[PDB]
């Protein structure tokens, strides 16, 4: 069967050309009429881009994207690559590349049935002028207001990091119950800040230790820290010297 | 081009509902539209073909319907594996166009257990002093977190990230960041998130103060 | 333009939608095919196939319209494909394409390609069994290089004794001799010089290629009459489309669907029977709606197998007017116009149905009723009701009045 | 009003006249009778009788259409007389009077009172001989206190296995019963109480008098059925004038054409059948151009046999809203207008054809398609270019959106 | 066979009720469902006046008579009768009384062709106020330029009488050749008057007796005069006294 | 009502020619017509029903036919027993109107002997004198009279009577009545008629004078 497999870097400055290559694995690119790739913006629909033949090197693009996307060819490593250029913010998207089939009917009619059988996983692609930076990431410690119904949760803020993504993982992934991990949100200064909390018993507090372990492959970097509630008793030791 | 306009943009079901989803056409196809499924994560994946035809593989409960300008995808018996991003998709013409996509929840009711948490004091002298909001296993997805600081609304230093629908418990959770500089942190005393949830009655506010601890 | 499709036995319910039509006019008489079938058109079961002669008669409005005398109806719908028709002395030759491994054009290398051809009457007696429908026997397909040969196109012509059905020659590609400089990427930069042999078939690394044509069936031949193969002149030449060669004002005509790269319209006038050489019109303003690569008015040398059957009648030849239905339409196949065009342009036109009607084959026939030049066009109209295709037949009378 | 009138063969050269038409609708069958004369239509000598079954179809624009499929004609059509058509249960039953002494209304005295009725199948099959045609033999008329009795109106209705044609009964004027005090003289005052009674029959003193009625052919009386005459009521009763019961909206309707003085439409929903029970509509804006002496708009008892036949269907019971064609004219039966009145007001109208083009009896059916009220009117238009009669249809689709 | 006969006055002063009657021969007025009334005045064309049903009362009549015409009935003496009212000089005609015949084909329709069948002789019937008069009859003498080409004519003059008709025979009846009793006119008195000459040799002017019997029966006047040629010698014979 | 207009008034033709007779009606009238024989001095009499069929009794020769509004009556081999009136009648409305009639003529081409006879002694006698004009045997029918009267025409004084047409000869006789009175009459001397006819080449003048016998 044929297996797709996108590959790419996965940040590109604004206004220059995304390098995309859709390695065919199983199959040979000879056959298939057609090689489509089809991108989804984050939280919009999918929008195709453009086929190529893989037979032949004739290209159809669509006409939102025509005067900018390039797709090219390389038959001796049975891929076929993505070029887009003068990139937005507005061309973060996921990039799929999809095995394009016709479904023919009544060869005296050549109008065929379109659609994408086999797809590739896809990559994320982000748009940004911000540099590969290690994440900065700051516990959240419990307090007496993190109470409801006898249960205090805790976590760790991951902060201003960049590229996607990072995996957090709890006591070496031993921890799985609770365990919320949120997707990353982008900030006005350019770089990810996301949150990760895990729901807990308020009486196993002070009793068990809670590490979030923070990996960003891109940067490589390795944060791990324990979680400890606030001290309060401290601050208000003033010795009175008569 | 043909646009595909899906509707609704996202609908919620419990498991066995009957789930019907259109993708109307801008221009009329005779019959060439394709259905898509997008699991979280995951390529999507071809349903219905030709707008009429079950896939191999795909169960039978997946149906879909109609030709020309309204296209529809029934669901008979919902399931829990069925709770995935649905595009229709078509072929009738070059460039093709999918719809916006229709994602599918779950109807069960629940109440959110509000948390807060102050900022850590090594991120107190990293530079930047965040307070999140947090807020664990509610339906639905749509609420409001609005930030009050001394009782005094606070806006356009906030930022929400809700995770995708888990499937041990079918809830949601999520962390409301507010972003703020040390100078605005120690000039201002309560630092509180109001939740308003379908599941709770009342108004549920939870705040901390930086002199208490 | 006046419908007049309501003496056949074309309207189904619903559920059942009107596929792989048929209309071919000779001498006063008609034939009509077509394909019901149970749901979907693509992926439908098909229920019957009717291969229905008749005659066209003058109702009482001087509108002509199509009255089957005969009727015929294989057993098995499901092998029967590309049928084309031929009239011959009263008799009515219509000569098919058994397949049993699904479409002879799709699934070629494993198609038999075995043909079956079948005679109508007319005029139909009342015990007439033998007489009306005579299934004839093909037991000897004279192909030459061409592997297998197949009727593909509505109608065919005589001369005399002998029919000539439009045809396709399943080439295999190797044998194909195409040389690579005959390409036309003169013009435009986006069309490599070997697009015009890959384009030339189906796939581009498809195993067959095909090359229109005709099928020579001299009725003289004997007992078994045998079904001779002749391929069209390689003079613009593009993938084998379904043809239809008509005699208009004495000498034939061969219509070849723009099934290609040539989107133009690529009809002409026959200089020679056997060898088929065709004078194509060098047309440039007829076109049909290619769907992706290929739409309409493209003429760069491109890989595709898109567009759409839609025949043209040569109504005049001193002035070399040509009338028939064409989608107005870039890509999409709809808004059919009965348009009457001449070679570099259209003299006026008459729009069928509604802008964003989608259309689908259309076959055009023109003939004299009392010195009238009238027009017969048969059109799938996608009826937007009740979302099925339905072949809707138009009379148009030429006018001799601006 | 569109012209659907080539799907009959109506269409003769200008030789001859059609005359003496029927159009019977049920369930999507039709019926079609006429006479075709030599010349004249009056004195003209008759060449066929068409009896022709089919079925209603659909063209591409949505308009019903005649199909004949099954046509009988009398191997002598000097002797059939006055036929009315019932469907029953996908057969076509015609029933009709044989006459050797002429038209049986005119030369009532001498006429043997002898009936024909003929089955016709709205399926015909393909070699289905008594299944097609099969005269039934009437050896059994159950007339009553009646000397002779006819089937004297254009279409009946069945009910269940039971028909009932439109009929007249020739009923000797001596043995007439009516009291002359029930004759609506008060309002007028040229009307003696006593023209009421001799306008009864087609001449003050003949012999026989016309009273209409229906003609009970039950089925289930076995291999040879009784043709029971049913009378019908008193109330609003006049000349026994060609009838039409037909089913519409569940309830039968029973239209009794203006022969006579109460030159207004005489029809109205059916209360029982037998006996026959119609309650009139109380119309006071449809009324038929008599010639002389019974103009149209005339309501005083006088003594005429004139008129025409002008039925009107019911489309509307809720609001009693019916359709049919009209001649709007005084005295000339010209100009006919298909209008769509209420009991007193008309709502809307469409002039089928010209201000002065003279027009004869006018039968109108109306049905559904696909849940739509269209209505089938044959109208008999003289033709100015060939001087002679033809009956023209009329597809008129009820609108919805005034 | 049925045979009518009108009957009536033939003087009708103008302004008052005319009175005809068409007695009914060889048949019953119970039959033949309509009897028409039919005129036709002296220079003009027919035109229809009105029918009875006979067996019934109901009477229909020309709308540009409908006001004034009535037509009356008689089962005992088997006649019917017409009563013109208010008759002027434009009533003059010959009012025929006829069977209207109807012709009916295909009596599912009741529209007969009508015509008359049976016509009645009429009777001339002339609106004058003049009383009855008798003619006088005064000669036409030939003379020397009554004479052409060797045929010398002479006739009689009728004056001054009415009504119609008046018989003009010759010799008592003997003379037929060349008879040409002209027919008469309407003067501005209102009297009537018409010649009454023949054409005879020259030759045989002084030997034949010519006498012109005119007949008046409304008058009972009978006039025999005889035509002799003007004597021209008595006048110039005077008579020299000395 | 129907107005029934015939064409021409009144024809002339010979023995053994074809006559045409042509009614029109101002409506439409089907077949709805019948023709009529009208010989002078008698009932007319019905040739043709229904415009196409011939009578019992009459002749093959008349022939009727046309429908709608142009009707027409053909006498294919006329003889000498057809010269009356023919009329036409329209039975399909009430009032019936007839046409206005046709009248036939015999067109045999002769001279007339022209005579002028002198009032009478007697006439004189009783107060008027009226000079009478003859015109013996001619054709056509239609001519032409002037009264003269010493060189001076005098009108509105004439009264014409022409007998209807002879079947011993077919022609004419004609006489115009000069009524004047008598101190009218010897007022004058000369008292002539004119005559203008198609078969006399110069206009024939009779004239007397009063002084002469």
Chains 1, 5 share one sequence.
Not at chain 2, 74 to 80: F, G, N, V, Y
């Amino acid at each position: 069967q044929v297996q797709l497999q996108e590959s790419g870097p996965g940040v590109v400055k604004p206004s220059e050309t995304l390098s995309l290559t859709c390695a065919v694995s199983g199959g040979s690119i000879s056959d298939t009429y057609r090689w489509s790739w089809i991108r989804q913006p984050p939280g919009k629909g999918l929008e195709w881009i453009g086929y190529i033949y893989g037979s032949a090197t004739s290209t159809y693009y669509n006409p939102s994207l025509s005067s900018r996307v390039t797709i090219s060819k390389d038959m001796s490593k049975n891929q076929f690559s993505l070029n887009l250029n003068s990139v937005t913010a507005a061309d973060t998207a996921v990039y799929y590349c999809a095995r394009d089939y016709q479904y023919y009917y009544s060869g005296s009619y050549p109008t065929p049935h379109n659609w994408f059988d086999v797809w590739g996983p896809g990559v994320l692609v982000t748009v940004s002028s911000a540099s590969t930076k290690g994440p900065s990431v700051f516990p959240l410690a419990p307090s007496s207001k993190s109470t409801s119904g006898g249960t205090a949760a805790l976590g760790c803020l991951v902060k201003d990091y960049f590229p996607e993504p990072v995996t957090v993982s709890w006591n070496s992934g031993a921890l799985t119950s609770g365990v919320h991990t949120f997707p990353a949100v982008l900030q006005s200064s350019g770089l990810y800040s996301l949150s990760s909390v895990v729901t807990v018993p308020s009486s196993g507090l002070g009793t068990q230790t809670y590490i979030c372990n923070v990996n960003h492959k891109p940067s490589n970097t390795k944060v791990d820290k324990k979680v400890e509630p606030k001290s309060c008793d401290k601050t208000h030791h003033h010795h009175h010297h008569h | 081009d043909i646009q595909m306009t899906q509707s609704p943009s996202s609908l919620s079901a419990s498991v066995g509902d009957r789930v019907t989803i259109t993708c109307r056409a801008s221009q009329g196809i005779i019959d060439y539209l394709s259905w898509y499924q997008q699991k979280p994560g995951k390529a999507p994946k071809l349903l219905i073909s030709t707008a009429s035809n079950l896939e191999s593989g795909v169960p039978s409960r997946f149906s879909g319907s109609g030709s020309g300008t309204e296209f529809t995808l029934t669901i008979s018996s919902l399931q829990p594996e069925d709770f995935a991003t649905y595009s229709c998709l078509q072929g009738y013409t070059t460039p093709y166009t999918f719809g916006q996509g229709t994602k599918v929840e779950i109807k069960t009711v629940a109440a959110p257990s509000v948390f807060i948490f102050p900022p850590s004091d090594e991120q107190l002298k990293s530079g930047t002093a965040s307070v999140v909001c947090l807020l664990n296993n509610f339906y639905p997805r749509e609420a409001k977190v609005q930030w009050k600081v001394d009782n005094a609304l606070q806006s356009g230093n906030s930022q929400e990230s809700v995770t995708e629908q888990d499937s041990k418990d079918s809830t949601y959770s999520l962390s409301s960041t507010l972003t703020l500089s040390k100078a605005d942190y120690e000039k201002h005393k309560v630092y509180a998130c109001e939740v308003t949830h379908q599941g709770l009655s009342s108004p549920v506010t939870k705040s901390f103060n930086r002199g208490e601890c | 333009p006046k419908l007049i499709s309501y003496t056949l036995p074309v309207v189904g319910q619903s559920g059942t939608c009107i596929t792989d039509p048929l209309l071919a006019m000779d001498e006063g008489y008609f034939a009509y095919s077509h394909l019901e079938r149970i749901g979907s058109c693509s992926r439908g079961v098909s229920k019957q196939r009717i291969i229905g002669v008749g005659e066209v008669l003058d109702r009482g409005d001087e509108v002509p319209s199509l009255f089957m005398t005969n009727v015929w109806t294989p057993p098995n719908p499901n092998t029967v494909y590309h049928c084309s028709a031929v009239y011959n002395n009263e008799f009515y030759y219509v000569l098919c394409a058994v397949s049993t491994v699904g479409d002879p054009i799709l699934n070629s290398t494993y198609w038999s390609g075995s043909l079956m051809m079948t005679r109508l009457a007319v005029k139909p007696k009342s015990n007439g069994g033998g007489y009306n429908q005579h299934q004839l026997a093909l037991r000897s397909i004279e192909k030459g290089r061409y592997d297998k040969v197949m009727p593909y196109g509505p109608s065919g012509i005589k001369q005399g004794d002998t029919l000539y059905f439009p045809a396709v020659g399943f080439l295999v590609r190797t044998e194909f001799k195409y040389n690579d400089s005959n390409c036309p990427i003169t013009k435009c930069q986006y069309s490599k010089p070997e697009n015009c042999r890959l384009s030339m078939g189906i796939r581009p690394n498809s195993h067959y290629i095909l090359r229109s044509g005709l099928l020579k069936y001299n009725l003289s031949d004997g007992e078994n009459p045998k079904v001779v193969f002749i391929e069209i002149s390689d003079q613009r030449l593009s993938i084998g489309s379904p043809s239809k060669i008509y005699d208009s004002l004495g000498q034939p005509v061969f219509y070849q669907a723009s099934f290609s790269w040539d989107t133009m319209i690529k009809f002409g006038d026959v200089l020679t029977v056997n060898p088929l050489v065709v004078n194509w019109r060098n047309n440039t303003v007829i076109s049909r709606p290619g769907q992706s690569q290929c739409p309409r008015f493209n003429t760069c040398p491109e890989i595709c197998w898109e567009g759409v059957y839609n025949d043209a009648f040569l109504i005049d030849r001193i002035n070399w007017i040509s009338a028939g239905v064409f989608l107005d339409s870039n890509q999409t196949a709809e808004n059919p116009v009965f348009t009457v065009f001449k070679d570099n342009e259209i003299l006026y036109r008459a729009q069928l149905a509604s802008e964003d009607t989608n259309a689908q084959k259309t076959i055009t026939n023109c003939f004299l009723l009392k010195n009238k030049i009238w027009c017969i066009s048969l059109v799938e109209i996608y009826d937007t009701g009740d979302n099925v295709i339905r072949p809707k037949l138009f009379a148009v009378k030429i006018p001799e009045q601006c």
